[PDB]
Write a protein that binds this DNA or RNA. Structure first.
Lengths: 149, 149, 149, 149
DNA sequence: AGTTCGTGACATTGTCACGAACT
DNA sequence: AGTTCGTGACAATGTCACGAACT
DNA sequence: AGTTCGTGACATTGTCACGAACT
DNA sequence: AGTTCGTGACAATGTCACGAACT
């Protein structure tokens, strides 16, 4: 584990997640009978501030089908929680026009690197384009002198 | 004005947005009293597919603040609704690393262009600088070949 | 007249020429009857050392058909007589193989000049061929340096 | 031995040469006495087309000196006789100015070659030097063209 | 040894065709 | 226009000097 | 003036697919 | 082999701030 896993903080996240899924209309419970599940949900609503308890609840009453998905969601939020501390470890979200993203994705795939890294290469290559043009004509002139001389 | 406003569709959107905000714990109503407020919330729960009525609610029972926000939320849901019918009108979400996004942003603001228009120029300016190292490598090869013969 | 015409000397030439034609079997006489001509010839044989007389003889008895030819032969011998004084005004006679003369004639015609002059140009061009080869490689090297540099 | 000796032909040649030399005032015979000498001259005048006899005369009545000279004269008339049957075996007579012939002779003696073989080398060595000013003018044009583009 | 033969290099002589110069 | 001249390019014939093979 | 609409720019949150690391 | 983690690439939804036209 690269990031530290704070039991207190994540249990709260898992709680909010399980609660959010419910008001969204999903099966947080593993129980099929609407009685044992209907209750498991009611109890869970109490665990709001009891971390240790939330972990237990999950073990007995949560739908096995949410197990991996939640592991993803919480895993990702953990990362994001700590990357938020310094700006160089943060990510920025932007939208690009379809066609523009397409040209950029193709580039990156072909070069074999990340979208970000590709953008950095583009910025550095595109900046030296001027120092390269003048490098062509300067080279093209010096040669024309080697001939008539 | 560009896209068309389908009253029927755009009304259910406005509804789904109210029931959602309320189930999330926000002041849908503009009545400080929990009496009049709760009174409205119940009605708005049966206006499911009665668009004719849904609007009546907004006009009569809606929180000032939420109104302005719902307005921008809908124009966005609209535009995206119609933009999703053709690829060259769709948008792609990506995430860049902070520092990489900053360098891209600096360029864009500098030139007054959008992030997509800036990626597009960088890609063309870089393809140009690349065609310069090529033509310089082609000339050294074309000339060098004739003298061997 | 560029060369001086010595009456004494040329009359002797004309005499020898007229005598040579006869022993060669020709009509030195203009006379068709073998009597007036047969005699004119006999007289001419006496003029051996009398120049002034030879001129007269020619006027009365020589075949009009030898008139131009002798003018050529004597004209040419005069030139040759004086060109023999200095070696730079002399001509030298040589034989060339058919094919060789042919290549040389073509050259001279095309350039528009004398066989001699053509031979001089050939000798001077063919001598500078070495200074021209080394002028090609030296030029071919200096250029290969302008490239890798 | 190369050419064939046509006794019939080569005999009349020997005859025409004797009657000629005698009509020119030379000692055809080898008899100091004008008696025996003139005796022979008369016989040799009827051997016109009797080759069988013509030779008998040479063996019996011919001036020593003239014999040796007639020998070289005939070998020449022979070789030319047969060389005139095909162009690439014929010879062309030209005249060069003295000084021009001298420069040509110097070269030939130097290289041990004949005058024709020397004209042939000069023509090839000059065509070579010319192909050098050409290739040097072609390269300056080929290179110069690529840099304009 | 001495001589034949072929051959390259000229010398002589004659012509022709061309164009400049003079009449 | 017609003629005289000088001239370049050959041809035709004769010699000579070599040099390699034939006697 | 005040408000609608379209729009570019992000922030949040959730997922998936991938591969390194550990068990 | 099975699982846990960090991670890059998106989607989907909501806001905000502009700016140009509609009221």
């Amino acid at each position: 584990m690269k990031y530290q896993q704070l039991e207190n903080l994540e249990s709260g996240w898992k709680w909010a997640y399980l609660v959010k899924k419910h008001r969204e209309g999903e099966a947080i419970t593993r129980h099929i009978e609407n009685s044992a599940a209907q209750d498991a949900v009611e109890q869970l609503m109490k665990l709001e501030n009891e971390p240790v308890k939330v972990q237990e609840w999950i073990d007995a009453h949560m739908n096995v089908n949410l197990a991996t998905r939640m592991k993803q969601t919480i895993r990702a939020r953990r990362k994001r929680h700590f990357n938020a501390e310094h700006q160089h470890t943060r990510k920025k979200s932007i939208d690009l026009e379809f066609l523009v993203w397409q040209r950029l994705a193709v580039l990156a795939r072909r070069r074999g690197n990340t979208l970000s890294d590709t953008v950095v290469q583009l910025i550095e290559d595109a900046e030296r384009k001027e120092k390269y043009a003048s490098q062509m004509s300067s080279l093209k002139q010096d040669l024309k002198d080697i001939l008539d001389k």
